[PDB]
């Protein structure tokens, strides 16, 4: 097998194995603030940020035809000053090695429009806090699987626990082609899960970079934090 793994049980203000894009930064306290937060903890609108692990991950192989299994865990908080006006959300994603931030707000930095496009070569699990009816978003905050489109191929309800840390596990099984995403809140004891088959071979290039992307709302007051506290990842591509 070809394998890659890492663990950040915290982040550090100097973190050269993490490529930070847009407004993403690591605080002195070890938290990866994806979108802008001021000194009092107040999130800011019109914000887009991304963090990706610096080394490319081999996700499938042309000669053999085999695809990697992977698993990734992370712990994150979304705090909203007013839970009545929130946006836009965060996502864990795989994309080409040279990927740059796309459109912000509803596009979660990952897509440019409503339309499905094979050229994005982007698979993402989204944690979506704002309904874009333009994107067939469901009437509730939700988890979705985004395969070359911001119009999720599947979703499920996720009830946000304001300002509480959420623990996420995302897994992908090569043999079954099943992507599974689960979110638990230890404080509230609530838990949510989604599963769907996704063919990585037809969507991603052989080599990808993985990380996070998050956006705050375009309008004043539609603001929330996207704080990652910890992150671990492991892939295995069998020969």
By the criterion CB under 8 A, which residues form the site for a copy of itself? Answer: 1-10, 12, 14, 16-17, 53-58, 69-73, 97, 154, 169, 171, 173, 176-178, 180, 182, 184-186, 189-197, 206-207, 232-236, 239
CA-atom Rg of the chain in angstroms = 17
With respect to Ca ion, which residue has the nearer C-beta, 106 or 211?
106
Q: Kindly state whether residue 217 participates in binding Mn ion, applying the rule CB under 5 A.
A: no
Binding mask 141-170 for Mn ion (x = CB under 5 A): ---x--------------------------
In the numeric block, the tokens 């990952």 are attached to: 110
Region near Ca ion per CB under 5 A, out of 7-15, 121-129, 190-198, 206-214: 121-129
Residue 53 CB, nearest approach to Ca ion (Å) = 25
Percent helix, percent strand, percent coil in the chain, to nearest 5: 5, 45, 50
Which residue among 23, 88, 128, 224 contacts Mn ion (CB under 5 A)? 128
Q: Which residues contact 169 (CB under 8 A, 6 or more apart)?
A: 71, 72, 73, 180, 181, 182
Shortest CA distance to 125 belongs to which of 55, 190, 184, 198?
Answer: 198
Which residue among 23, 59, 107, 137 contacts Ca ion (CB under 5 A)? 137
In the numeric block, the tokens 């490319």 are attached to: 56
Partner whose binding site includes residue 196, from Mn ion, a copy of itself, Ca ion, none (CB under 5 to 8 Å by kind): a copy of itself
Residue ranges binding Ca ion (CB under 5 A): 106, 128, 130, 132, 137
């Amino acid at each position: 097998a070809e394998e890659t793994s890492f663990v950040f049980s915290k982040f550090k203000p100097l973190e050269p194995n993490l490529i930070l894009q847009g407004d993403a930064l690591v605080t002195v306290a070890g938290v990866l603030q994806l979108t802008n937060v001021d000194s009092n903890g107040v999130p800011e609108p019109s914000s887009l940020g991304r963090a990706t692990y610096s080394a490319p991950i081999n996700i499938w192989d042309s000669a053999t035809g085999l695809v990697a299994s992977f698993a990734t865990s992370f712990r994150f908080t979304i705090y909203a000053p007013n839970i009545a006006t929130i946006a836009d959300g965060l996502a864990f994603f795989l994309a080409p090695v040279a990927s740059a931030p796309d459109s912000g707000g509803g596009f979660l930095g990952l897509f440019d429009s409503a339309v499905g496009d094979t050229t994005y070569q982007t698979v993402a699990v989204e944690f979506d806090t704002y309904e874009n009816t333009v994107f067939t978003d469901p009437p509730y905050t939700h988890i979705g699987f985004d395969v070359n489109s911001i119009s999720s191929i599947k979703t499920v309800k996720w009830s946000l626990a304001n300002g509480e840390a959420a623990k996420v596990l995302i897994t992908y099984n090569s043999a079954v082609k099943l992507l599974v995403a689960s979110l638990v809140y230890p404080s509230s004891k609530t838990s949510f899960i989604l599963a769907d088959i996704v063919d990585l071979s037809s969507v991603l290039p052989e080599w990808v970079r993985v990380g996070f992307s998050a956006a705050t709302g375009a309008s004043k007051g539609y603001i929330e934090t996207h704080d990652v506290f910890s992150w671990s990842f492991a892939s295995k591509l069998a020969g």
